[PDB]
Amino acid sequence: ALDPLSETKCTLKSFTVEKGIYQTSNFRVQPTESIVRFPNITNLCPFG
Amino acid sequence: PVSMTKTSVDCTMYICGDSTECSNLLLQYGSFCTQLNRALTGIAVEQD
Numbered sequence: 001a002l003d004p005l006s007e008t009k010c011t012l013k014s015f016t017v018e019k020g021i022y023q024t025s026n027f028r029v030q031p032t033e034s035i036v037r038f039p040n041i042t043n044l045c046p047f048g
Numbered sequence: 049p050v051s052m053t054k055t056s057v058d059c060t061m062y063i064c065g066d067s068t069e070c071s072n073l074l075l076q077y078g079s080f081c082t083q084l085n086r087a088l089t090g091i092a093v094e095q096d
């Protein structure tokens with residue numbers, strides 16, 4: 001996880017990397033906030 | 049016909065989405081879809 005060169009070294013399971021382009025991992029945007037949207041009702045259920 | 053569309057399908061995003069527990073369970077199956085990703089990438093290169 002140091003840098004892309006080390007990541008592609010780990011992906012190839014070798015310390016020397018030949019010339020070329022290698023697929024290593026996937027980029028994904030992590031979420032920032034949590035959103036909850038429930039109906040505005042507040043009457044307690046007749047469970048009791 | 050000469051070539052077909054180059055499609056790359058990812059394991060962890062398809063089988064498990066963005067679920068860490070599902071990925072941890074998927075690790076038990078070994079390297080099945082390291083093989084799958086490799087095969088799809090090889091087809092992609094063969095098209096060019």
Ligand SMILES: *[C@@H]1O[C@H](CO[C@@H]2O[C@@H](C)[C@@H](O)[C@@H](O)[C@@H]2O)[C@@H](O[C@@H]2O[C@H](CO)[C@@H](O[C@@H]3O[C@H](CO)[C@@H](O)[C@H](O)[C@@H]3O)[C@H](O)[C@H]2NC(C)=O)[C@H](O)[C@H]1NC(C)=O
Nearest residue numbers: 033034035036037038039040041042043044045046047048
């Ligand atoms: C079963 O019933 C009990 C008792 O309730 C009372 O007696 C019954 C015979 C009926 O006449 C009821 O209408 C009557 O209220 C329930 O206990 C009560 O539950 C309510 C709801 O949570 C409690 O209210 C809260 O209590 C405290 C202050 O005391 C604060 O959190 C709130 O301001 C709110 O008032 C009430 O205190 C409580 N009463 C007693 C005697 O403990 C019980 O919940 C119910 N069973 C089930 C499954 O709901």
